[PDB]
Amino acid sequence: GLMQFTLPVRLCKEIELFHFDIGPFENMWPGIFVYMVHRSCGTSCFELEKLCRFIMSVKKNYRRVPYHNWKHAVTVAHCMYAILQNNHTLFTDLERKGLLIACLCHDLDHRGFSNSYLQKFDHPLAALYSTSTMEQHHFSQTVSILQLEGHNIFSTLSSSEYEQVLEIIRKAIIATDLALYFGNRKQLEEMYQTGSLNLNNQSHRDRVIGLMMTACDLCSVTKLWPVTKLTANDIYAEFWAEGDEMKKLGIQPIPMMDRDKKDEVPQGQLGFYNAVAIPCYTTLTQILPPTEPLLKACRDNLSQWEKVIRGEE
Numbered sequence: 001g002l003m004q005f006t007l008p009v010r011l012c013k014e015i016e017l018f019h020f021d022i023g024p025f026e027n028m029w030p031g032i033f034v035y036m037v038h039r040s041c042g043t044s045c046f047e048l049e050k051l052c053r054f055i056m057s058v059k060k061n062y063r064r065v066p067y068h069n070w071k072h073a074v075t076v077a078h079c080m081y082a083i084l085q086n087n088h089t090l091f092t093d094l095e096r097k098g099l100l101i102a103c104l105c106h107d108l109d110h111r112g113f114s115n116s117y118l119q120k121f122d123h124p125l126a127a128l129y130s131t132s133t134m135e136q137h138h139f140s141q142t143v144s145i146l147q148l149e150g151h152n153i154f155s156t157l158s159s160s161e162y163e164q165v166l167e168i169i170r171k172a173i174i175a176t177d178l179a180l181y182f183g184n185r186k187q188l189e190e191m192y193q194t195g196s197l198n199l200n201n202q203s204h205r206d207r208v209i210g211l212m213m214t215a216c217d218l219c220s221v222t223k224l225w226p227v228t229k230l231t232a233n234d235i236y237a238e239f240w241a242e243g244d245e246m247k248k249l250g251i252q253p254i255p256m257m258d259r260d261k262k263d264e265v266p267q268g269q270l271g272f273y274n275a276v277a278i279p280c281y282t283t284l285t286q287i288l289p290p291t292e293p294l295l296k297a298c299r300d301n302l303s304q305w306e307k308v309i310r311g312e313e
């Protein structure tokens, strides 16, 4: 109860910033997450024995893939922590509890392959879940881990609070299906511009939580340039392996996944920042003004990718 987690001074300071990198020491990531839960939620939100056993089961159910791994889970949870801390009064106690856990769990048991590859492969998960295939798997895995003896971190919530937090987590994890992001941001863009956006409207909150999840999930593009660039290597290592597996099924992959088109990466990154990243953090910065540093970081990184094309790096 009186047991805080405490980080070294550089981490204590930098963890509060949107662009914090969690570092290469895996054995500190659990404590970094607990630290974030304690400051974001309170030292009473979770029984420490049950939270620590939840964190270690979640870690075990992430695989050794180049990008969609345990480090990504903790990184995405840190971005969410930064959003919640800079927007203190806007979120309920249940939402703060649920969203950090949703981020930690959002890619549980990822295999390093897109929904599209599962469908073309004819993977069993694609028969069980026709859309948001991996994302429904991730939520399924989250529920399974919550139901292990000793792993129910939500046990001290009332019946209705428990149903509300699982519903927050489910929507939050489904929203990380990027195929749903485009329509979600268009709607939010319309509602903000016509003035109809209303954070007391549950269907509006859902949409805003949806965009926060996309923003945390894409946060690789909001780091300092050297983190952004080195993370892109891991992203393309998964994508190119998937492209290799498409070719094995006798399907030419899209250029994004074809390692034979490495050359076009800088131009592909431009389209991505223009089509997805910038619109995302722009609409988020309109709805949640204190998240502006993410939009500034993203634009800085667009400019770094522009310089790569121009041969300046």
Ligand SMILES: Cc1cnc(C[S@@](=O)c2nc3ccc4ncsc4c3[nH]2)c(C)c1OC(C)C
Pocket (backbone or CB within 6 Å): 178, 218, 220, 221, 232, 235, 255, 256, 257, 261, 262, 263, 264, 265, 266, 267, 268, 269, 270, 271, 272, 273
């Ligand atoms: C953070 C991040 C960084 N990079 C990417 C890849 S996106 O930049 C991209 N789009 C294209 C289109 C054509 C193309 N030809 C050769 S590489 C390449 C591309 N890379 C994604 C998808 C990303 O987000 C995924 C995690 C969804």
Ligand SMILES: [Mg+2]
Pocket (backbone or CB within 6 Å): 106, 107, 134, 176, 177
């Ligand atoms: Mg995912």
Ligand SMILES: [Zn+2]
Pocket (backbone or CB within 6 Å): 072, 076, 106, 107, 176, 217
């Ligand atoms: Zn993710």
